[PDB]
Amino acid sequence: FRKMAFPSGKVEGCMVQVTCGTTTLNGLWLDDVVYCPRHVICTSEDMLNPNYEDLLIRKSNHNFLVQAGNVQLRVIGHSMQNCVLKLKVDTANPKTPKYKFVRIQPGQTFSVLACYNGSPSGVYQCAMRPNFTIKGSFLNGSCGSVGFNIDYDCVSFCYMHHMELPTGVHAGTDLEGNFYGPFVDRQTAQAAGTDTTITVNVLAWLYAAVINGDRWFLNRFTTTLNDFNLVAMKYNYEPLTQDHVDILGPLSAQTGIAVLDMCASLKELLQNGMNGRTILGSALLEDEFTPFDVVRQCSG
Amino acid sequence: FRKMAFPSGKVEGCMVQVTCGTTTLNGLWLDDVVYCPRHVICTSEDMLNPNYEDLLIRKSNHNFLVQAGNVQLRVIGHSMQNCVLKLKVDTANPKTPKYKFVRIQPGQTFSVLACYNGSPSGVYQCAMRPNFTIKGSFLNGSCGSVGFNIDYDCVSFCYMHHMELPTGVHAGTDLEGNFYGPFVDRQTAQAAGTDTTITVNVLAWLYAAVINGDRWFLNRFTTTLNDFNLVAMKYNYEPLTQDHVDILGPLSAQTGIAVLDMCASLKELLQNGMNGRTILGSALLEDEFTPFDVVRQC
């Protein structure tokens, strides 16, 4: 299996840069609105302990430089929504795709188009960790880069990049400006909660193994969801939600292995170890492929 | 640090669908020419031993259905260059980027835009293996998917997809239609030469793991280039050339770890293993990052 990103072209057509003073980051231009991290209005020193409301009241439309390439887009309105700025511009983006703003759950994967100065550099797949961080590849100037999934013709935007934590992982918001997890856009030291393994994705990976004929680990037992959840937490695995059980439904139907039976097989892997055996050519259980991801690569 | 593909928009705007009879794959539309695998003209029977020049002369321009979105493009001429068919169309693609056709060296990396029915489906990074296969994710209908690099605003096309081997790896051509490797576009089970690991890439990746605070695998030992290469070759790793050592300079400087000291670390990893430990998440030595891929991202 491969980490596979979505084609980025529909999102490339929406990236711009947004500058306040000498502070530049990326923004997302959809219809006649540009979305970007509100800390663009901060000086480097203001980032230590910003008063965003006070900083915004000192701002006018003509203090925002929005550029698509070297072409200025005139700002005609500004407002703050949580931790994002919405800049109304005088031109509707002709490359605007069909789109949605979605707030994803931990475990879900999405493509990141890493951008600098409004120019895309690279695309790659990220998983939202249970502690609401992602393992990005973000350098200075990358804020405002977005994460997305593409369903049919529709781009669902789910992430906008804001910061790096002390452990080197990354944090940010949805496109309504609400942070994932307990973080704030202040340049203070903040700690991610201890990370856990994404159980629903490990199960997706076991289904993937079965689809390809690798099924030694399937056992004759089942379990209750509560029993599995209590055992799993003792191994630093996430508990399963009802939504997780539902998103495993298609793989369960494809293989005929009930979800809770697969949970029983996973429990035995956790309790007795691999005992030297491999699954899909690996002794490590992979937890960054969602059920959707497994389908995309077993038939798309 | 992360396996990162080039942004694919400039290539998405060139992908079309190409059908001949009951066979459908993708084409690359640049200016007024569409490029695609020549085996689109094959039937079921033809698969096993196609006499392409003979099958091609029996086809007419109207036997090729080319679709770009909702629109059919009219084929007004066709020619063959090696294993790629060139269909001239009456329309120029307005989204044609600045481009060039390059043949890549084994060990070099490129992005793949996987497409089905003319539609982009995903994008990922691959390397040309030393045995001239690629470990891709390609299903039925993926042929004509292309691989590429982007330098400034210019797309260098280096790979077009044609087949899967029984081991599950993949083979294809450059955009002149010449295969990478000893493979042939006939419907047969083909095996590759013994694959080897791209050593300069493993070293680059180890330098990456250090840059990101991961240095458990290091050691105080050193090695000569030739003595390292003896052990490398024993473990089916490619030999390291002095140009490879030179190429690794910037990473050496940045970390203060001499290239041959990192070779000593890799030699130790090869002979002992990882003993359960992991590097940048991996239980295996990754060899599809080039030194350039690492620096650009650091």
XYZ file of C-alpha atoms in Angstrom:
598
model
C 0.000 0.000 0.000
C 0.955 3.668 -0.602
C 0.032 6.917 1.079
C -1.758 8.503 -1.911
C -2.799 12.138 -2.043
C -5.695 13.551 -3.994
C -4.887 15.461 -7.176
C -4.192 18.964 -5.990
C -5.116 21.033 -9.049
C -8.552 22.130 -7.852
C -6.935 23.447 -4.642
C -3.902 24.962 -6.396
C -6.350 27.164 -8.285
C -7.489 28.612 -4.936
C -4.179 29.477 -3.217
C -3.147 33.090 -2.743
C -0.827 34.955 -0.444
C -1.903 37.422 2.242
C 0.502 39.958 3.703
C 0.209 42.351 6.596
C 3.327 44.478 6.870
C 6.151 41.985 6.421
C 4.121 39.005 7.718
C 3.110 36.773 4.815
C 1.196 33.527 4.737
C -1.183 31.689 2.447
C -4.908 32.107 1.962
C -7.735 30.200 0.283
C -9.660 32.142 -2.374
C -13.171 30.744 -2.946
C -15.771 32.808 -4.769
C -15.083 36.384 -3.554
C -13.751 35.505 -0.118
C -10.186 34.808 0.999
C -9.732 32.727 4.164
C -6.489 32.789 6.126
C -5.067 32.454 9.648
C -5.821 35.548 11.691
C -2.297 35.735 13.018
C -1.319 37.347 9.714
C -2.202 40.620 11.533
C 0.504 39.974 14.175
C 4.013 41.277 14.294
C 6.562 38.675 15.344
C 6.547 40.210 18.852
C 2.746 40.368 18.932
C 2.659 36.592 18.394
C 3.932 36.045 21.951
C 0.654 37.215 23.522
C -1.701 38.731 20.948
C -4.939 40.584 21.560
C -6.567 39.715 18.239
C -9.633 41.934 18.691
C -7.474 44.980 19.452
C -5.125 44.203 16.570
C -8.086 43.912 14.201
C -9.714 47.211 15.212
C -6.539 48.974 14.135
C -6.786 47.339 10.683
C -8.558 48.548 7.567
C -9.184 46.884 4.210
C -6.288 48.790 2.660
C -3.774 47.252 5.103
C -4.240 43.754 3.578
C -2.205 42.807 0.510
C -3.780 39.800 -1.175
C -1.990 38.471 -4.237
C -2.681 35.670 -6.698
C 0.812 35.304 -8.028
C 1.984 38.908 -8.446
C -1.570 40.127 -9.173
C -3.161 42.124 -6.369
C -6.728 41.309 -5.339
C -8.397 44.314 -3.766
C -9.856 43.702 -0.306
C -13.289 45.266 0.216
C -14.274 43.778 3.572
C -12.782 41.938 6.520
C -14.116 39.999 9.477
C -12.759 37.521 12.031
C -14.403 34.118 12.535
C -12.789 32.323 15.436
C -9.133 31.961 14.410
C -9.573 32.712 10.707
C -9.889 35.951 8.825
C -12.409 36.284 5.984
C -11.318 38.937 3.508
C -13.953 39.951 0.985
C -12.303 40.703 -2.363
C -13.582 42.431 -5.448
C -13.087 39.429 -7.783
C -14.787 36.053 -7.670
C -12.245 33.284 -8.248
C -12.989 31.803 -11.699
C -11.234 28.578 -10.598
C -13.513 28.036 -7.613
C -14.434 24.328 -7.455
C -17.547 22.839 -5.998
C -16.626 22.791 -2.304
C -17.711 22.148 1.263
C -16.238 23.042 4.630
C -16.085 19.942 6.834
C -14.774 19.250 10.303
C -13.128 15.844 10.401
C -12.813 13.357 13.267
C -9.508 11.973 14.565
C -8.365 9.068 12.444
C -9.545 10.628 9.199
C -6.982 11.278 6.497
C -6.672 14.190 4.111
C -4.271 15.631 1.594
C -2.180 18.686 2.450
C -1.056 21.063 -0.267
C 1.963 22.674 1.363
C 2.327 26.245 0.104
C 4.791 29.101 0.457
C 4.067 32.677 -0.650
C 0.908 31.453 -2.357
C 2.849 28.932 -4.467
C 2.313 25.195 -3.984
C 5.409 23.164 -3.155
C 4.135 19.628 -2.528
C 1.153 17.441 -1.729
C 0.993 14.593 0.782
C -1.401 12.604 2.928
C -1.861 13.331 6.660
C -3.879 11.651 9.377
C -5.585 13.563 12.163
C -4.172 11.952 15.330
C -6.387 11.185 18.349
C -4.598 14.009 20.172
C -5.662 16.398 17.356
C -2.230 16.907 15.890
C -0.949 15.940 12.457
C 2.548 14.929 11.354
C 2.981 17.535 8.648
C 6.004 18.790 6.787
C 5.674 22.522 7.342
C 8.339 25.222 7.210
C 8.160 28.937 7.943
C 5.619 30.622 5.693
C 3.408 27.519 5.404
C 0.474 28.770 7.512
C -2.738 28.960 5.545
C -1.886 25.755 3.682
C -4.996 23.633 3.639
C -5.993 20.012 3.999
C -8.783 18.521 1.919
C -10.552 15.485 0.510
C -12.092 15.312 -2.953
C -15.392 13.440 -3.381
C -16.471 13.225 -7.014
C -16.006 16.838 -8.119
C -16.366 18.352 -4.663
C -13.463 19.550 -2.533
C -14.182 19.185 1.197
C -11.811 21.528 2.993
C -11.050 20.261 6.490
C -7.776 21.819 7.729
C -5.874 25.108 7.689
C -2.372 25.210 9.098
C -1.456 27.493 12.020
C 1.389 26.197 14.221
C 4.091 23.730 15.261
C 4.156 22.254 18.771
C 7.342 21.565 20.753
C 7.365 17.876 19.770
C 7.495 18.788 16.061
C 3.879 17.941 15.215
C 1.448 20.475 13.782
C -1.882 22.000 14.768
C -4.529 24.114 13.071
C -8.206 24.759 12.509
C -11.096 23.847 10.256
C -12.155 26.423 7.689
C -14.491 28.004 10.256
C -11.436 28.816 12.370
C -12.071 26.345 15.204
C -8.898 24.617 16.316
C -8.743 20.869 16.356
C -7.978 19.933 19.930
C -7.005 22.153 22.847
C -4.656 24.570 21.102
C -4.655 28.367 20.782
C -2.922 30.598 18.234
C -0.451 32.132 20.702
C 3.275 31.526 20.376
C 3.434 29.924 23.809
C 4.604 26.427 24.679
C 1.645 24.045 24.372
C 1.700 20.271 24.809
C -0.170 17.698 22.787
C -1.885 15.041 24.856
C -0.316 11.623 24.676
C -1.050 10.076 21.301
C -2.836 6.768 20.831
C -3.187 4.312 17.976
C -6.111 4.786 15.589
C -8.008 1.553 16.149
C -10.519 2.027 13.336
C -7.698 2.366 10.840
C -5.829 -0.661 12.171
C -9.025 -2.659 11.610
C -9.318 -1.227 8.086
C -5.740 -2.445 7.552
C -6.673 -5.950 8.767
C -9.578 -5.986 6.295
C -7.122 -4.870 3.625
C -4.903 -7.815 4.533
C -7.845 -10.225 4.266
C -8.894 -8.825 0.864
C -5.387 -9.732 -0.394
C -5.498 -13.273 1.006
C -3.463 -12.672 4.201
C -5.733 -13.958 6.945
C -3.822 -16.109 9.446
C -4.853 -13.728 12.268
C -8.596 -14.374 11.882
C -9.816 -16.304 14.949
C -13.071 -18.085 15.797
C -14.187 -15.659 18.557
C -16.121 -12.395 18.786
C -16.451 -9.711 21.479
C -18.694 -6.922 22.623
C -17.781 -3.402 21.637
C -17.496 -2.280 25.282
C -15.241 -5.234 26.189
C -13.001 -4.514 23.202
C -12.854 -0.807 24.063
C -11.818 -1.456 27.666
C -9.060 -3.877 26.625
C -7.896 -1.667 23.771
C -7.333 1.353 26.018
C -4.925 -0.763 28.096
C -2.747 -1.031 24.951
C -2.989 2.714 24.176
C -5.455 2.076 21.364
C -8.381 4.433 20.869
C -11.851 3.201 21.787
C -14.224 2.730 18.890
C -17.277 4.903 18.332
C -20.515 3.861 16.673
C -19.407 5.938 13.657
C -16.234 3.847 13.414
C -18.305 0.676 13.410
C -20.406 2.179 10.625
C -17.487 3.258 8.445
C -16.081 -0.321 8.611
C -19.396 -1.548 7.212
C -18.388 -1.701 3.538
C -15.155 -3.648 4.239
C -17.055 -5.954 6.585
C -19.570 -6.618 3.789
C -16.822 -7.089 1.174
C -15.087 -9.728 3.327
C -18.075 -11.135 5.244
C -16.179 -10.652 8.522
C -18.312 -8.868 11.116
C -16.685 -5.830 12.663
C -16.774 -7.250 16.194
C -15.218 -10.503 14.986
C -12.367 -8.512 13.528
C -12.124 -6.688 16.880
C -11.729 -10.075 18.578
C -8.889 -10.900 16.157
C -7.224 -7.590 16.877
C -7.541 -8.112 20.624
C -5.718 -11.439 20.272
C -2.953 -9.691 18.312
C -2.623 -7.164 21.128
C -2.687 -9.775 23.886
C -0.451 -12.433 22.300
C 1.650 -10.296 19.961
C 2.523 -11.088 16.364
C 4.697 -14.012 17.505
C 7.063 -13.150 14.660
C 4.445 -13.313 11.910
C 3.835 -10.478 9.457
C 0.663 -8.907 8.049
C 0.829 -7.366 4.582
C 4.587 -7.763 4.738
C 5.104 -5.980 8.042
C 5.186 -6.748 11.761
C 3.846 -3.240 12.435
C 0.124 -2.531 12.376
C -0.503 0.511 10.170
C -2.964 3.115 11.540
C -2.992 5.907 8.907
C -5.158 4.183 6.233
C -8.851 4.780 6.716
C -11.574 2.400 5.483
C -12.138 4.783 2.573
C -8.380 4.729 1.853
C -8.353 0.926 1.784
C -11.150 0.938 -0.788
C -9.448 3.598 -2.980
C -6.393 1.310 -3.348
C -8.158 -2.034 -3.607
C -10.363 -0.580 -6.405
C -10.756 3.019 -7.680
C 9.781 15.075 6.811
C 7.306 13.219 4.589
C 7.044 11.498 1.202
C 5.915 14.428 -0.906
C 4.612 14.618 -4.458
C 4.760 17.583 -6.801
C 1.500 19.520 -7.122
C -0.336 17.814 -9.949
C -2.521 20.574 -11.443
C -0.374 21.227 -14.499
C -0.601 17.511 -15.391
C -4.312 17.123 -14.560
C -5.083 19.630 -17.278
C -3.543 17.316 -19.840
C -5.192 13.971 -19.046
C -7.744 12.600 -21.518
C -9.473 9.308 -22.233
C -8.560 7.188 -25.265
C -10.660 4.276 -26.487
C -10.087 1.851 -29.325
C -12.742 -0.840 -29.579
C -13.380 -2.186 -26.083
C -10.047 -1.005 -24.636
C -9.886 2.260 -22.726
C -6.896 3.929 -21.069
C -5.559 7.438 -20.482
C -3.736 9.832 -22.766
C -1.530 12.894 -22.298
C -2.711 15.871 -24.444
C 0.062 18.411 -25.130
C -0.584 21.087 -27.780
C -2.400 19.211 -30.591
C -0.963 15.760 -29.828
C -2.245 13.046 -27.492
C 0.268 10.457 -26.271
C -0.788 7.044 -24.992
C 0.246 3.389 -24.773
C 0.091 1.670 -28.131
C -1.561 -1.398 -26.669
C -4.854 0.443 -26.696
C -5.183 -0.812 -30.308
C -5.025 -4.426 -29.145
C -7.912 -6.811 -28.751
C -8.063 -9.753 -26.387
C -6.409 -12.112 -28.867
C -3.746 -9.585 -29.893
C -2.553 -9.333 -26.268
C -0.378 -12.447 -26.351
C 1.776 -11.524 -29.362
C 0.840 -8.190 -30.966
C 2.493 -7.249 -34.266
C 2.008 -3.562 -33.559
C 3.074 -2.101 -36.918
C 0.681 -4.568 -38.566
C -2.186 -3.835 -36.170
C -1.558 -0.090 -36.471
C -1.688 0.068 -40.285
C -5.170 -1.510 -40.163
C -6.565 1.288 -37.961
C -8.159 4.523 -39.109
C -8.180 7.888 -37.371
C -11.891 7.330 -36.631
C -11.159 4.095 -34.721
C -9.736 6.247 -31.884
C -12.214 7.905 -29.530
C -10.473 10.623 -27.494
C -12.529 12.417 -24.857
C -11.542 15.407 -22.721
C -14.328 15.836 -20.199
C -17.676 16.183 -21.962
C -15.979 16.764 -25.324
C -14.700 14.450 -28.036
C -11.454 15.479 -29.739
C -11.186 14.672 -33.439
C -8.156 12.533 -34.361
C -6.707 13.786 -37.667
C -3.615 11.627 -37.893
C -1.788 8.974 -35.919
C 1.777 7.697 -35.698
C 3.743 5.347 -33.444
C 7.051 6.046 -31.686
C 8.323 2.850 -30.022
C 5.611 1.774 -27.532
C 3.692 5.085 -27.543
C 0.982 6.125 -29.965
C 0.799 9.793 -31.004
C -2.703 10.922 -31.976
C -2.903 14.285 -33.734
C -6.108 16.107 -32.885
C -7.798 19.114 -34.427
C -7.679 21.019 -31.111
C -4.827 22.495 -29.118
C -4.947 21.975 -25.374
C -5.026 25.503 -23.891
C -3.798 24.157 -20.558
C -0.562 22.714 -22.010
C 2.234 23.684 -19.589
C 5.843 24.379 -20.375
C 7.215 20.862 -20.673
C 10.042 18.577 -21.695
C 10.447 14.819 -22.111
C 13.207 13.300 -20.017
C 14.480 9.792 -19.509
C 15.243 9.295 -15.824
C 18.140 7.322 -14.230
C 17.514 4.521 -11.746
C 17.488 5.921 -8.232
C 15.784 9.152 -9.301
C 12.308 9.975 -8.055
C 9.201 11.365 -9.708
C 5.555 11.968 -8.984
C 2.873 9.736 -10.434
C -0.600 11.038 -11.325
C -2.738 7.922 -11.331
C -5.744 8.298 -13.650
C -8.716 6.134 -14.704
C -10.992 6.897 -17.679
C -9.122 10.115 -18.287
C -9.780 11.300 -14.692
C -7.049 12.007 -12.116
C -7.531 9.874 -9.025
C -4.411 10.259 -6.860
C -0.827 11.449 -6.712
C 2.212 9.894 -5.091
C 5.993 9.718 -5.214
C 7.885 6.766 -6.790
C 11.462 6.050 -7.762
C 12.932 4.305 -10.776
C 14.280 1.141 -9.141
C 17.719 -0.125 -10.147
C 16.003 -3.059 -11.910
C 13.845 -0.478 -13.800
C 10.541 -1.331 -12.162
C 8.501 1.049 -10.053
C 6.583 0.188 -6.919
C 3.377 1.890 -7.986
C -0.287 1.706 -7.168
C -1.864 1.036 -10.515
C -5.100 -0.861 -11.155
C -6.994 -1.801 -14.324
C -7.431 1.214 -16.595
C -4.414 3.106 -15.227
C -2.335 2.802 -18.403
C -1.281 6.146 -19.812
C -0.903 7.562 -16.326
C 2.321 9.581 -16.297
C 5.191 10.330 -13.966
C 6.856 13.718 -13.804
C 8.990 16.265 -12.009
C 8.454 20.017 -11.883
C 11.321 22.520 -12.074
C 10.340 26.193 -11.936
C 7.127 26.251 -14.032
C 8.313 23.401 -16.297
C 7.025 19.818 -16.229
C 9.554 17.129 -17.156
C 7.598 14.024 -18.120
C 9.611 10.878 -17.521
C 7.223 7.904 -17.288
C 4.105 6.510 -18.905
C 2.460 3.464 -17.411
C 1.953 0.192 -19.350
C 1.894 -2.941 -17.170
C 2.025 -4.812 -13.887
C 4.341 -7.700 -13.172
C 3.301 -10.815 -11.221
C 5.216 -9.626 -8.134
C 2.926 -6.590 -8.132
C 5.493 -4.008 -9.249
C 5.071 -1.964 -12.429
C 6.789 -1.187 -15.722
C 6.466 1.456 -18.394
C 8.220 3.772 -20.799
C 9.586 7.241 -21.176
C 7.588 9.596 -23.362
C 9.529 8.455 -26.420
C 7.980 5.019 -25.909
C 11.129 3.154 -24.803
C 10.636 0.881 -21.826
C 12.580 1.218 -18.679
C 13.990 -2.261 -18.271
C 13.832 -5.523 -20.180
C 10.067 -5.517 -20.421
C 7.778 -5.807 -23.429
C 4.205 -4.602 -23.975
C 2.794 -8.073 -24.583
C 0.299 -9.832 -22.306
C 2.718 -12.229 -20.575
C 4.095 -12.883 -17.120
C 7.432 -11.077 -16.938
C 9.995 -11.148 -14.145
C 12.498 -8.431 -13.388
C 16.140 -8.583 -12.588
C 17.164 -8.819 -8.966
C 16.218 -5.594 -7.302
C 18.784 -3.763 -5.243
C 18.461 -0.948 -2.729
C 19.321 2.644 -3.728
C 22.137 3.309 -1.241
C 22.603 7.052 -1.789
C 18.880 7.418 -1.067
C 19.060 5.365 2.123
C 21.910 7.601 3.311
C 19.944 10.739 2.427
C 17.040 9.436 4.434
C 19.242 8.637 7.420
C 20.528 12.206 7.290
C 16.878 13.269 7.277
C 16.110 11.240 10.407
C 19.000 12.961 12.171
C 17.909 16.467 11.086
C 14.549 15.656 12.732
C 16.155 14.656 16.041
C 16.536 10.916 15.455
C 20.092 9.610 15.860
C 19.947 6.260 17.686
C 21.466 4.434 14.668
C 24.676 6.531 14.604
C 28.006 5.220 15.890
C 31.566 6.422 16.497
C 32.963 4.159 13.763
C 34.036 5.055 10.240
C 34.735 3.153 7.031
C 36.438 3.525 3.715
C 34.362 3.925 0.598
C 35.525 0.635 -0.880
C 35.042 -1.366 2.329
C 31.546 0.052 2.645
C 30.811 -0.878 -0.982
C 31.949 -4.454 -0.301
C 29.334 -4.805 2.424
C 26.692 -2.906 0.477
C 27.030 -5.220 -2.504
C 26.865 -8.253 -0.238
C 23.428 -7.070 0.933
C 22.228 -6.206 -2.613
C 22.694 -2.463 -2.098
C 23.946 -0.388 -5.022
C 27.556 0.759 -4.741
C 28.120 4.328 -3.621
C 30.090 6.429 -6.112
C 32.259 9.432 -5.327
C 29.630 11.556 -7.107
C 27.093 10.178 -4.633
C 29.419 11.210 -1.792
C 29.706 14.675 -3.328
C 25.937 14.936 -3.760
C 25.579 14.168 -0.062
C 27.825 17.073 0.983
C 25.098 19.578 1.870
C 23.436 17.046 4.151
C 26.812 16.239 5.678
C 27.649 19.895 6.331
C 24.195 20.681 7.726
C 24.532 17.821 10.246
C 28.302 17.702 10.707
C 28.253 13.976 9.972
C 30.802 12.906 7.400
C 29.358 10.868 4.563
C 31.596 7.915 5.384
C 30.545 8.111 9.034
C 26.919 7.688 7.915
C 28.104 4.782 5.746
C 29.487 3.213 8.913
C 26.074 3.661 10.545
C 24.332 2.033 7.573
C 26.846 -0.805 7.523
C 26.016 -1.421 11.206
C 22.274 -1.359 10.458
C 22.697 -3.837 7.610
C 24.684 -6.343 9.654
C 22.750 -6.149 12.944
C 19.299 -4.960 11.914
C 17.069 -2.523 13.716
C 16.447 -4.835 16.702
C 12.817 -3.724 16.753
C 13.665 -0.014 16.673
C 12.302 2.190 13.883
C 13.483 5.224 11.919
C 11.104 8.055 10.979
C 8.303 5.573 11.687
C 9.653 2.870 9.379
C 10.654 -0.656 10.337
C 12.659 -0.748 7.097
C 15.328 1.352 5.447
C 13.590 3.704 3.020
C 15.303 4.217 -0.344
C 12.936 6.425 -2.403
C 14.132 9.838 -1.147
C 16.970 11.380 -3.119
C 19.406 13.834 -1.521
C 17.603 16.628 -3.425
C 14.233 15.422 -2.121
C 15.599 15.687 1.397
C 17.203 19.139 1.098
C 14.256 20.767 -0.676
C 12.200 19.608 2.325
C 14.820 20.781 4.862
